[PDB]
Ligand binder design. Structure first.
Ligand SMILES: C[C@@H]1CN(C(=O)Cn2ncc(-c3cc(F)c(OCc4nnc(SC5CCCCC5)n4-c4cccnc4)cc3F)n2)C[C@H](C)O1
Ligand SMILES: Nc1ncnc2c1ncn2[C@@H]1O[C@H](COP(=O)(O)OP(=O)(O)O)[C@@H](O)[C@H]1O
Ligand SMILES: Nc1ncnc2c1ncn2[C@@H]1O[C@H](COP(=O)(O)OP(=O)(O)O)[C@@H](O)[C@H]1O
Ligand SMILES: Nc1ncnc2c1ncn2[C@@H]1O[C@H](COP(=O)(O)OP(=O)(O)O)[C@@H](O)[C@H]1O
Lengths: 746, 248
């Protein structure tokens, strides 16, 4: 029945598009772009435009917040559709801006923020419709008051659109619920989806939770580095679901009189309870409830007990949800970590490489970014930046664009608003500055991310690409077989081989394949823990992996702790040590987590204590050898990929001449070749500038890495592994290997 | 259009010099040292002297705090110019010191802190003009009350300068905004420039920040070893931009 469908989040938006599935649109009687005539809840309909994408699943209908708020529909609701593929034009379309969105910007809004949207964008034009256009550095929205066709009309230059007048007030009877929502959350889509599936039912469906019986999460402990969006995601999941959001940020209460602040918190909870669907969000819970024994006295504990008696005092039949924001909740009171008060503790974490792109896209919506800017180089370069840092960079670029145009902006008495705001056009040249003049907030936190190094990048090693794909992808794709033969999947793999041979690359590729987070604790971090007499910090790292999705917790450069103290011989102590022992102890806990696939990497395995390479722990040894001829050819081609290269070079000859070079030093050879090529190119460029400046007053002296550049780089090459070192790895492999081919009798 | 230009910090100062660029002064119709007849904001003009240095960039006009405070102009504002390369001499130039700058120093101020500035320094002599001379261990400032040529005059021994009298009170209606500023900040020019580019727009242009939308820095955390000038630079960027400074 195509009449009714359940709404869902849209990704294409365009301020107008409603996305369906063609195998479903055929039932909906729409093919390419036919009008939808979307039917709402109370007393309104929208024309909308039909389109399709991947996430439809032939089950759900997707609408951006513009349509959802226009139709008085919250995400997760059920709505109706009245398909009508017909074309009808209007002549008296009149629109007025919304004072809530225009309260200090004055100008020709019919031209400054309207021209690029009233044609070819297919606005949901219909009397009473409200639409956002996202103009000059502000999410300006308008309402079309009169539309003489209805409920559908052609959005085309044939239809006549008239000029507006003075701004009108927003409808306080409904408030339009603009605020924020899911569409302006980026870089934490998985965590936002987890929160949605965790909190949508109790807030949208409080009626069933008095009959279902099963207790939903009374409180959700959002946490992450400061400025990660905890407040933003909380407010989005509040407004998007229609739940009343009560912010009781810690300092606002801890600053009040002792005893009176307790009353303030209690009455905040009472305010949350008086209306069923409300949710109360406790920002900066570290201040409110730090470690109990580390508090001084009076308020710092008077609140905590007062909080606890209210945190679990609620019966959960009032439909009140207590969300909280903290930083690595190891700091908050352990008493709050109990169940019935905070039973779900999603980790937002810093945005990853491709999440910062989305954050920039959403924040750089109204800036009217120039065409030469890409926002993908900026996202990649902003490594460690938290979403707050991305917003700060956005604002800094905007301010510099204003400040590089203050000469022609202050012509009249300072700013007159006016169309001039569109001229800013923040080019890359301003982003570069803002990025270089902003300090990452969270640069010293283990970043959980899905690495974007695919199987193709790691050429050469092939038996290990299939001997490693097995352990990871077989017990997830067909777990039924594994529980039949009785073997427990091996949640452990350590790569031992010559230094710099793709261990990190192989682990990252494994993470990439099964869309899995990749937490690399490099050797220097383990040395920091060992030297610092803080091996307990290891407990955090493993926990950081546990709270995440399927995670290849990768101990890069393992055995560095032992390598830093001679090893099994040459030192008074034995093989075991602080950090390795703590890793061993905590690993046995994550031997039953069935999502984490602990990986190790070692450049010198024989010093590793054998206590870890036994069943349950990193039992499965894998040997990656130094690349062979064909493998070296593959590595050369793969690591020179994404860089210009001439047809003259034949990588087969280089590979065979590359007799005994590992992956790291082979990529070093490629980098030296590229370095010499860029030096030649820049020298030729400055020489061409010299010619330009002199009397005479062919533009590509070296448009790719030339062959003799590779010649010179190879002449400048260097190898890091000797015959004895490479033989040592195979000799060690003989320890857990055998040549018992004699027992051929089955 | 040479009529209007945006002001900027000066480095040569001399208590009188206004710096332009010769590739721009040609448009301004001034060559070596011709009078400028600087035009202010409300109801005043200054003669000033034209000169050039590196930082002009053919875009900005540079004026020291003496001229800026004289013309009621804050650094970063937009002002006008009325070039007039002409020479005219006066005969009844009368000057009086400012009580805010003379409140315990008594002497022949016509000779003790005046001789090395009333000739060859080209003071912005014009009725109502206020100028600092920086005399004996105090930034003593004066106001020239009457100048029978105007708005420009020759600052030379041919022009007659008369003796002063008892000190006069500073104009509390405007307060003259002497305090401190960028000219007395040294050793942190890069940091002061960073703070200027960070804070000038929100303070000078609060009107656009209600419409532009992008959030400016709500707070700036100056820091450094004690006695580094944190308070000094904060007060300079406050007064220089006209923002009210509240020390807590
Ligand atoms: C008592 C015991 C058990 N016993 C039995 O008879 C029952 N029994 N037989 C088999 C299993 C079983 C256990 C699992 F833990 C499991 O986990 C699947 C999984 N899900 N997600 C990931 S993440 C993966 C890697 C990183 C992120 C990207 C994707 N993996 C994963 C991947 C690789 C390795 N390990 C888990 C699946 C299973 F079938 N239970 C008898 C025996 C003698 O002793
Ligand atoms: N994931 C995100 N998506 C979009 N904006 C974000 C995100 N994280 C942070 N921000 C930006 O950083 C600012 C602070 O957001 P948030 O972290 O929710 O509050 P707080 O910094 O007080 O915890 C907001 O203005 C918001 O625009
Ligand atoms: N196909 C490949 N095989 C091996 N190494 C590669 C390949 N492609 C690139 N590399 C290079 O190998 C390096 C990874 O070194 P790695 O083996 O992780 O060091 P370690 O062995 O100390 O962990 C990267 O710097 C990368 O440039
Ligand atoms: N960069 C500077 N330029 C000029 N004077 C300075 C500078 N830094 C410090 N001073 C001098 O040191 C004194 C203290 O200035 P400041 O450091 O701003 O206050 P505080 O010492 O209370 O922080 C002032 O009298 C000032 O003249």
């Amino acid at each position: 029945r195509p009449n009714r469908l359940i709404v869902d989040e849209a990704i294409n938006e365009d301020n107008s598009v409603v996305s369906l599935s063609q195998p479903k649109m055929d039932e909906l009687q729409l093919f390419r772009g036919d009008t939808v005539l979307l039917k709402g809840k109370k007393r309104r309909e929208a024309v909308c435009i039909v389109l399709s994408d991947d996430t439809c699943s032939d089950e759900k209908i997707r609408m951006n917040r513009v349509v959802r708020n226009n139709l008085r529909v919250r995400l997760g609701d059920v709505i109706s559709i009245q398909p009508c593929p017909d074309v009808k034009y209007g002549k008296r379309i009149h629109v007025l801006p919304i004072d809530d969105t225009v309260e200090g910007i004055t100008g020709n809004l019919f031209e400054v923020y309207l021209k690029p949207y009233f044609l070819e964008a297919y606005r949901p034009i219909r009397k009473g419709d409200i639409f956002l256009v996202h103009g000059g550095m502000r999410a300006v929205e308008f309402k079309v008051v009169e539309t003489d066709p209805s409920p559908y009309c052609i959005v085309a230059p044939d239809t006549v659109i008239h000029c507006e007048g003075e701004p009108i007030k927003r409808e306080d009877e409904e408030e339009s619920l603009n605020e924020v929502g899911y569409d302006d959350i980026g870089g934490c889509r998985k965590q936002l989806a987890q929160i949605k599936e965790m909190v949508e039912l109790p807030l949208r469906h409080p009626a069933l939770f008095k009959a279902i019986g099963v207790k939903p999460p009374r409180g959700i402990l959002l946490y992450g580095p400061p400025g990660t969006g905890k407040t933003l995601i909380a407010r989005a999941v509040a407004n998007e679901t229609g739940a009343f959001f009560f912010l009781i940020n810690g300092p606002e209460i801890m600053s009040k009189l002792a005893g009176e602040s307790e009353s303030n918190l209690r009455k905040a909870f009472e305010e949350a309870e008086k209306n069923a669907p409300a949710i109360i969000f406790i920002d900066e819970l570290d201040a409110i409830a730090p470690k109990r024994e580390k508090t001084h006295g009076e308020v710092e504990r008077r609140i905590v007990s007062q909080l606890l008696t209210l945190m679990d005092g609620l019966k959960q039949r009032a439909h009140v949800i207590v969300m909280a924001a903290t930083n690595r909740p190891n700091s908050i009171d352990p008493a709050l970590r109990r169940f019935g008060r905070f039973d779900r503790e999603v980790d937002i974490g810093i945005p990853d490489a491709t999440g910062r792109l989305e954050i920039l896209q959403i924040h750089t919506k109204n800036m009217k970014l120039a065409d030469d800017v890409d926002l993908e180089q900026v996202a990649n370069e902003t490594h460690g930046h938290v979403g707050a840092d991305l917003a700060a960079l956005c604002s800094e670029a905007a301010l510099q664009a204003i400040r590089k145009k203050m000469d022609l902006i202050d012509l009249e008495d300072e700013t007159i608003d006016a169309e001039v705001m569109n001229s800013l056009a923040v080019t890359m040249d301003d982003f570069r500055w803002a990025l270089s003049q902003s300090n990452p907030s969270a640069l010293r936190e283990t970043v959980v991310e899905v690495p974007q190094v695919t199987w193709e990048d790691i050429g050469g090693l092939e038996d290990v690409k299939r001997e490693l794909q097995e352990l990871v992808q077989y017990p997830v794709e067909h777990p039924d077989k594994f529980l039949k033969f009785g073997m427990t999947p091996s949640k452990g793999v350590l790569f031992y081989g010559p230094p710099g041979c793709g261990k990190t690359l192989l682990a990252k590729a494994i993470a990439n394949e099964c869309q899995a987070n990749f937490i690399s604790i490099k050797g220097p971090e383990l040395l920091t823990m060992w030297f610092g007499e803080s091996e307990a910090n290891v407990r955090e790292i493993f926990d950081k992996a546990r709270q995440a999705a399927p995670c290849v917790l990768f101990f890069d450069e393992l055995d560095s702790i032992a390598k830093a103290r001679g090893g099994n011989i040459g030192d008074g102590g034995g093989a075991a040590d602080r950090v390795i022992n703590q890793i061993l102890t905590e690993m046995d806990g994550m031997s039953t987590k069935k999502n984490v696939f602990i990986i190790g990497a070692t450049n010198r395995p024989d010093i590793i204590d054998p206590a870890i390479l036994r069943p349950g722990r990193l039992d499965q040894l894998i040997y990656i050898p130094l690349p062979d001829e064909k493998s070296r050819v593959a590595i050369l081609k793969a690591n020179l990929r994404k860089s210009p290269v001439a047809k003259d070079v034949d990588l087969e000859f280089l590979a065979k001449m590359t007799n005994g070079f590992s992956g790291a030093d082979l990529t070093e050879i490629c980098q030296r070749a590229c370095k010499l090529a860029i030096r030649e190119s820049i020298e030729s460029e400055i020489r061409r500038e010299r010619e330009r400046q002199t009397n005479p007053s062919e533009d590509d002296p070296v448009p790719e890495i030339r062959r003799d550049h590779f010649e010179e780089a190879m002449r400048f090459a260097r190898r890091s592994v000797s015959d004895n070192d490479i033989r040592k790895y195979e000799m060690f492999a003989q320890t857990l290997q055998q040549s018992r081919g004699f027992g051929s009798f089955r």
